[PDB]
Design a protein around this nucleic acid. Structure first.
Lengths: 360, 362
DNA sequence: GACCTCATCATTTTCTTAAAAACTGACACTTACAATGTGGT
DNA sequence: ACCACATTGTAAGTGTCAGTTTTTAAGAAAATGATGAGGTC
């Protein structure tokens, strides 16, 4: 309550309401009644022929609107994939990451194998010397430190899968065009030519979290397996919330929302680092100056379960780094702050009362 | 596909939803005072969209429950796959025949095993189930595809003690269709007749309201709501915080029950028009289950096979749906065909039925 | 022989403000399909 | 006791007046790129 530094939220008071309302009135009007009965089972092609036009001009992704699949959430976007694969597979999760591929697979007979990371990337040699079949990396930005995979590891990891023809690799975006200097690199979907990596996108940190649209992109000989095996399903996103975001990205008002949103977070990043570079005796920063959240490491010798529970007395919650890693971390207790939803004209009191609560 | 004169048993009429009363509540919720409602709140739905269903269904269909036991979802299949893993992999699942073509095909991705039954004019073959080894069976109390055979009251009190015999058995009910029967409105729900918690409730706002709002509630009993919140505490919802907080104010301040009664009378006015027109022939076309809801089944005693009859209606660009799909086995030497009217408008019914009849050789 | 702090320059897509324009809020009217009490033999 | 006929009681039919609402376009305007000025080490 009252101060919630969530690690991946968004700011509340800045999305355009009165611009969002106008594109509804071409969608649900008195001629429009064939937008009521249920259409195609994976979103209307006016929503996918624009996604294939957008990700070829902003992230270097190469895809066609008969292969991209829409869905809702990620947990419903992933559960149809585990049954599509089979049940003779052994998964790959990086050691601190998003707590998602693990927490699903507590229901299925499969097994997940961790793999170590560093400030250059994740390990690739242990990917070689085991028998893993599906691995899950975020090549644009590594949660939650902020590491970026180089080109030196990408050729090795993509060439690991080409020699034996039954392994896969899942890219999770989580954030792009929020870098403040430009688009990072062309993503790992761009460098594939043998159709071995699947995408997994999002529409929920960029624009609005609670509209529950998302998307993956399938490769060539798996798209006509998913369409063959699940041709008796239904779509999951409400079709009046899809032709909103067809004209929204045919007539160009998303490509002026994210560019507008960039500076509203950069102006928070500079005013949060100009408050933390005074107390540089202990509160070190690990990870780059990008994204929506910082990772302060506290060398002041208090314990983590006291450090989080100390902030709750003055109606403020932070998010620790015990639940994000399987093993137990170093003696300096890392703590993840965020700056998405805290507004600008209360940052210099928010961080002040947090660091006043901990130690002056 | 896109076609003219589509006759589907779920395609509701499109030209009678109060667009203005859809938009007066939609414009009310996106205000500057009404942020805190664009990020993610609760996961089983908004905490008032669940409070309101427990005073909609309680006095419109009879179900006694609490808003701590409700589960919202999306579709109904995403509401079923978050049940198929709450029970185990030691169960066997009982479907009807004929029925909806869902829970046969959904159970082909799993190691669970299903066994069919038969359906008579009193309901389902309840006498077969007591001497068979099934563990969860899925039935439709208040109606039945594709006939209309309401469950007779003796078999309901039999199938109560069926699932109240042991400890590991459950039953599902599927009352997709209610408040759309002409008089004696609907027999009250199988959830109401149970007082020992072995039946789960399952129904949806996508036949009444709009085909693509994609909301389906669910009710849970006490020893599965607790077991769902525990082993599913890390999901989110699958419907928005605007598609729910429209229908909270859409139902709090009146304009749902007026739509209910208006759509209740419109479809009776549609049905009697069909019963007037098709009665002029009873030579080869007997009609079964003439009374209820949104679809009739229309037999045919043509001197040729049933396969030619569905594809002959494509010759004049019309769509009809046979009954060799809703059943496992195929021995229908009387050719059965189900039809619908719920999408066709009144002004072209006269040409419409004459298209398919004289397309069949009249 | 290296790293990295301020300008101030021309092209440009965001930002409050302003004066003509489709519209819905709260009356009253104001008919139409049809619910329920008082009579036909 | 067996077989109807008509009142008040409202869901509807366009319009009233006004009001809190939507749509087009032009200067300043905050602020991004090729060029030109120092510092530290």
């Amino acid at each position: 309550i009252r101060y919630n530094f969530h690690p991946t939220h968004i700011d509340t008071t800045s999305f355009p309401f009165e611009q969002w309302r106008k594109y509804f009135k071409q969608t649900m009007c008195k001629e429009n009644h064939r937008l009521l009965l249920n259409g195609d089972h994976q979103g209307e092609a006016s929503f996918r022929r624009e996604i294939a036009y957008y990700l070829h001009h902003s992230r270097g992704v190469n895809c066609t609107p008969e292969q991209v699949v829409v869905g809702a959430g990620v947990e419903t976007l992933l559960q149809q994939l585990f049954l599509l694969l089979g049940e003779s597979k052994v998964y790959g999760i990086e050691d601190p990451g998003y707590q998602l591929m693990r927490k699903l697979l507590s229901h299925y007979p499969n097994d997940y194998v961790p793999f170590q990371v560093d400030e250059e990337g994740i390990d690739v040699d242990s990917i070689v010397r085991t028998a893993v079949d599906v691995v899950y990396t975020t090549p644009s930005r590594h949660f939650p430190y902020g590491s970026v995979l180089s080109i030196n590891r990408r050729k090795q990891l993509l060439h690991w899968a080409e020699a034996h023809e039954n392994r896969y690799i899942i890219e999770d975006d989580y954030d792009s065009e929020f870098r403040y200097t430009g688009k990072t690199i062309p993503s790992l979907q761009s460098m594939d030519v043998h159709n071995k990596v699947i995408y997994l996108g999002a529409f929920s940190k960029s624009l609005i979290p609670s509209v529950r649209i998302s998307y993956m992109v399938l490769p060539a000989p798996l798209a006509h397996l998913y369409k063959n095996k699940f041709s008796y399903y239904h779509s999951t996103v409400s079709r009046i919330d899809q032709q909103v975001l067809t004209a929204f990205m045919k007539q160009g008002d998303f490509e002026k929302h994210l560019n507008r949103m960039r500076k509203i977070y950069r102006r928070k990043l500079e005013k949060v680092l100009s408050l933390l570079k005074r107390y540089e005796d202990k509160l070190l920063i690990i990870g780059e100056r990008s994204g929506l959240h910082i990772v302060l490491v506290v060398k002041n010798g208090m314990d983590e379960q006291t450090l989080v529970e100390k902030a709750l007395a003055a109606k403020a919650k932070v998010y620790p780094l015990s639940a994000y890693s399987l093993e137990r971390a170093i003696h300096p207790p890392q703590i993840v702050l965020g700056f998405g939803s805290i507004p600008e004209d209360e940052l210099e009191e928010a961080i002040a009362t947090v660091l006043n609560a901990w130690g002056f």
